[PDB]
């Protein structure tokens, strides 16, 4: 009964969202600062439990909303659709920066999550292995033979998911609710336990994409529309999957795309 | 040569509304990494260009103040400095031309 | 003389109830007496209709036209008034809804031809109106596909009755 | 017809256009920066190329001396030219003049550009800085190159 | 002390009392607020003078409001009163208030409609000294400066442009 399991997971996610939002103290306002490279020293007076850096981007201009991918608060990465706390500095990250490593890692994690979601919607997972960006291919092992038709179907599903355009809802939740949501797959349970043991507390970041929920570490891409190209190279050995994808504003070319696909096919 | 029949409002509208005459939309407006003043591709920025123009004008005014009258054009190179900053040991014979100003965050 | 676009900014609606939509806020602003023609102003208005305020300003800042700067200043003033007076938090969440440009009060001068004649030289004046509605811009009406044409044809063929009889 | 035709007509004749180009070249040699239309900008750049070539040919050469005396009306820029722009670029060959573009003129709206000799003491111009190498596509290409190199 | 001003007012009134002043002050306050609700220009002019009329009317212009008065706490008490001639009088009161301001369109723009807030009163009065009457004068929020209510929308304070 996978449909019932997904429905229960979505219900648990909604209940956790309601619990996190109920503690709002009648909408408490704060004065957050922004220390960027352009138009200083602008500031913002947003909320602390609902407002997100996307609101600041909208207040500034649509260019930042269309280009911003990650907001650097106190030097740490954050998502575009995530509530902020503690008034501190604000920054913006794009693909054309001096050190766009955090953006690349977030895009890699988002591509891995999308590949996992497509695999789950095709017809048991294990985790999301963090592969370097230089590897040229995001991996996503899955426990259970694929052919050209299967790869084409996966690519079509990924393209449909991208066209759907859905936001990435994030939540910083403890390990108890994380295990309650994943009380079936032992691999995900062990992954959540390890992630909780790594952090000083049981807090663990989560993600939701419509009817798909998975655990990760760093932030991801807000909207799926930012992923322009997307393909599935091949499958390797429990079974390790591969794939390549390029974001919007960096449209390479058909030749470069085929070359990258051939390089990833390994 | 003279109009035999005045053009109707419909004909005038159809003549002054076709896509060939309408302003063609352009999609060559990016965001300048400096001061974010939305620059255009293959074209320099606006605020940075104005700053460079002002700096060049100030440097030319200083040169004129140091050069004096017209018809000079010495046969020696130039070296611009700022508040403090000991002259470079390599450029010792080159005539130094400066007055009072702080090095900005974009000049070498 | 007839000033109304400036008076429309004082319209007051009753207090909305909880079970009601957000109702996007409308904006009104226009500059009177502009030393410029009307056809070019209407061209600029048509060019700036479905686009948002940011894209509109971006296109105006690179439009080799005298009215471009005037329209940019008008849009900036409208945005400032909306953020200050009309009470609006988002500055980029505004899109153009209506944009026109009618003629103004024109004068008359002489041109002096190459003979014992002349012609009236009117001083063409114009105006410029803009309506910025709150919220994001709506999507453009996509072109009807072949399925829509087939459905319309089937409906037209099915909605036909006998003629000239009972 | 203008199939394979060079030299765009500017002034009221060859003399007018060549005099304007000479004045622009003199102004550039004096200030090292001029805002002129794109056509005149590229024409003066092409002329200054050969001017610097002649200046590099040698100073004692009567041909170069006559060319410098003609193309320079002030007559005071010949020594500065010969003793600055020829020895400074003693290593280069044809990497002179850096052409860019200006948005437009606030009067009649004209396509203007800027050209200047490299190594000038004036502040630098906002050249079109290419995308950094730490991006996504750049990192992918670097990884592909590393894999191709390791293949051997 | 304020006794000199009180005697001057009682001599220029001349009939006037002090213990019966807080009631009239509260009545004038409620009437002015009800007029602001209904937007009565004449009644407002008859009440609050011009030293504060354009201060609490120009900002509430072109927008509705839903103010509602209710029982108060702590009995009123005069603080200090002092005096072409005028008569400044200050009164202290602690009344439960309910602010529900709405935008030009409506929806809401300040606070809820069923939240009895507690705010102190420190309004100054004034009167002409022929046919004048005891009317408001100014507002004194000091000394204690409590925080303001949480604004719903988010404000963006721009920095020094270049
Ligand atoms: Mg000509
Ligand atoms: Zn710039």
Swiss-Prot record, chain A:
Keyword Transferase: no
Regions crossing the membrane: none
TGS domain mapped to chain residues: 28-94
Tissues expressing the protein: Isoform 1 is ubiquitously expressed. Isoform 2 is heart-specific.
Residues bearing the modification N6-acetyllysine: 91
CC per GO annotation: mitochondrial inner membrane; mitochondrial large ribosomal subunit; mitochondrial ribosome; mitochondrion
Cell compartments where the protein resides: Mitochondrion
GO BP annotation list: mitochondrial translation
Any GO MF annotation of the entry: nucleotide binding
Keyword Acetylation (UniProt): yes
Keywords: Acetylation, Leigh syndrome, Mitochondrion, Primary mitochondrial disease, Ribonucleoprotein, Ribosomal protein
Annotated disease: Combined oxidative phosphorylation deficiency 59: An autosomal recessive mitochondrial disease presenting with multisystem manifestations of variable severity. The disease spectrum ranges from lethal infantile Leigh syndrome to a milder disorder characterized by hypertrophic cardiomyopathy, lactic acidosis, attention deficit-hyperactivity disorder, and survival into adulthood.
Stated family: Belongs to the mitochondrion-specific ribosomal protein mL39 family.
Subunit structure: Component of the mitochondrial large ribosomal subunit (mt-LSU). Mature mammalian 55S mitochondrial ribosomes consist of a small (28S) and a large (39S) subunit. The 28S small subunit contains a 12S ribosomal RNA (12S mt-rRNA) and 30 different proteins. The 39S large subunit contains a 16S rRNA (16S mt-rRNA), a copy of mitochondrial valine transfer RNA (mt-tRNA(Val)), which plays an integral structural role, and 52 different proteins.
Curated annotation (Swiss-Prot), chain B:
Alphabetical keyword list: Mitochondrion, Ribonucleoprotein, Ribosomal protein, Transit peptide
UniProt main location, coarse: mitochondrion
Comp. bias regions, Basic and acidic residues: 91-103
Subcellular location: Mitochondrion
Whole-protein coverage range: 79 to 186 of 188
Any GO CC annotation of this UniProt entry: mitochondrion
Phylogenetic classification of the source organism: Eukaryota, Metazoa, Chordata, Craniata, Vertebrata
Protein name according to UniProt: Large ribosomal subunit protein bL32m
UniProt family annotation: Belongs to the bacterial ribosomal protein bL32 family.
From Swiss-Prot, chain D:
A cellular component term, taken from the record's GO annotations: mitochondrion
Keywords (A to Z) from UniProt: Mitochondrion, Ribonucleoprotein, Ribosomal protein, Transit peptide
Protein name per Swiss-Prot or TrEMBL: Large ribosomal subunit protein bL17m
NCBIfam families (alphabetical): L17 (TIGR00059)
Keyword Mitochondrion: yes
One GO term of the biological process aspect: mitochondrial translation
Subunit and interaction comment: Component of the mitochondrial large ribosomal subunit (mt-LSU). Mature mammalian 55S mitochondrial ribosomes consist of a small (28S) and a large (39S) subunit. The 28S small subunit contains a 12S ribosomal RNA (12S mt-rRNA) and 30 different proteins. The 39S large subunit contains a 16S rRNA (16S mt-rRNA), a copy of mitochondrial valine transfer RNA (mt-tRNA(Val)), which plays an integral structural role, and 52 different proteins.
Organism: Homo sapiens (Human)
Localization per Swiss-Prot or TrEMBL: Mitochondrion
UniProtKB/Swiss-Prot annotation, chain E:
Quaternary context: Component of the mitochondrial large ribosomal subunit (mt-LSU). Mature mammalian 55S mitochondrial ribosomes consist of a small (28S) and a large (39S) subunit. The 28S small subunit contains a 12S ribosomal RNA (12S mt-rRNA) and 30 different proteins. The 39S large subunit contains a 16S rRNA (16S mt-rRNA), a copy of mitochondrial valine transfer RNA (mt-tRNA(Val)), which plays an integral structural role, and 52 different proteins.
Encoding gene, per UniProt annotation: MRPL45
Molecular function GO labels: RNA binding; structural constituent of ribosome
Keywords in alphabetical order: Mitochondrion, Ribonucleoprotein, Ribosomal protein, Transit peptide
Family, as annotated: Belongs to the mitochondrion-specific ribosomal protein mL45 family.
One biological process term in Gene Ontology: mitochondrial translation
Protein's UniProt keywords contain Zinc: no
Function description: Component of the mitochondrial large ribosomal subunit (mt-LSU). Within the mitochondrial ribosomes, required to direct the nascent polypeptide toward the tunnel exit and position the exit at a distance from the membrane surface.
Localization of this protein: Mitochondrion
Major subcellular location class: mitochondrion
Organism: Homo sapiens (Human)
Keyword S-adenosyl-L-methionine applies: no
Protein name: Large ribosomal subunit protein mL45
GO CC aspect terms: mitochondrial inner membrane; mitochondrial large ribosomal subunit; mitochondrion
